[PDB]
Nucleic acid binder design. Structure first.
Length: 212
DNA sequence: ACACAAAATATCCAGATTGGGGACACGGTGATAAACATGGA
């Protein structure tokens, strides 16, 4: 129905299972977008549990919505190499096995990278109740978001759309994730996405319906 | 203490000359360290 714009000076979207060296994507993943939308709604996550894993999210009940992503200006990236919180991968021993109070004791720096600027025009098709809840949360009683204001109708920009095995893409993102829980599952099938540069509204294929 | 008148025409430099000779650095060195990940019985 109605959509909104946002911007931020710095951002970072680390792909999962990156390993030692971290990376990022020019466009935030769908799951991160959904998490941001849920956080702004003022509704907490369905899971309240603590342990080895803390993403136990059954899909039994969750508001339905369709999400599109826009991009107005390409952004470069930079890298910083300071420190990282290592997880032991070797038998190791000594001091780590002595104290053992949330130890994470071994430390070794490698790398990581961040973005230079972010400005997106996010598109949402949601029921009226969810939009009203968002309005109440924004107006009522990690350097990721700076400010938000709905300027839907003006300020056109490019969009993204999945591509079928034909022709060739340009300036396309590497990987994208729809739904994921950090345990044994099938992850997501569709990975490749490409942008299209045209002024008017995105096509019907651009909108993607999230299972959650 | 009254009135009247308060300059006019010619001319305002000419030559010769504006540097020459020698030299523009020599040696010695150009970081050194610590911070593991997988296999077979």
């Amino acid at each position: 129905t109605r959509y909104l714009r946002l911007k931020a000076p710095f951002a970072a979207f680390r792909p999962f299972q990156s390993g030692s060296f971290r990376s990022t994507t020019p466009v935030p993943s769908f799951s991160a977008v959904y998490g941001l939308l849920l956080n702004l709604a003022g509704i907490e996550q369905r899971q309240e549990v603590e342990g080895k894993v803390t993403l136990i999210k059954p899909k039994a009940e969750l508001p339905k919505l369709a999400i599109a992503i826009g991009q107005v200006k390409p952004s470069s990236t930079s890298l910083i190499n300071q420190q990282l919180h290592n997880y032991p991968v070797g038998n190791s021993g000594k001091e780590f096995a002595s104290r053992t109070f949330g130890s994470k004791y071994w430390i070794a720096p490698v790398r990581r990278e961040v973005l230079v600027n972010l400005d997106l025009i996010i598109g949402l098709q949601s029921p009226v109740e969810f939009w009203q809840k968002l309005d109440q949360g924004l107006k009522g009683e990690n350097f990721l978001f700076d400010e938000i204001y709905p300027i839907e109708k003006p300020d056109l920009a490019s969009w993204y759309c999945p591509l079928e095995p034909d022709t060739r893409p340009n300036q396309g993102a590497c990987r994208l994730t729809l739904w994921i829980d950090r345990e044994n599952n099938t992850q997501t099938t569709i990975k490749v996405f490409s942008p299209s540069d045209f002024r008017l509204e995105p096509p019907a294929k651009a909108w993607q319906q999230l299972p959650g």
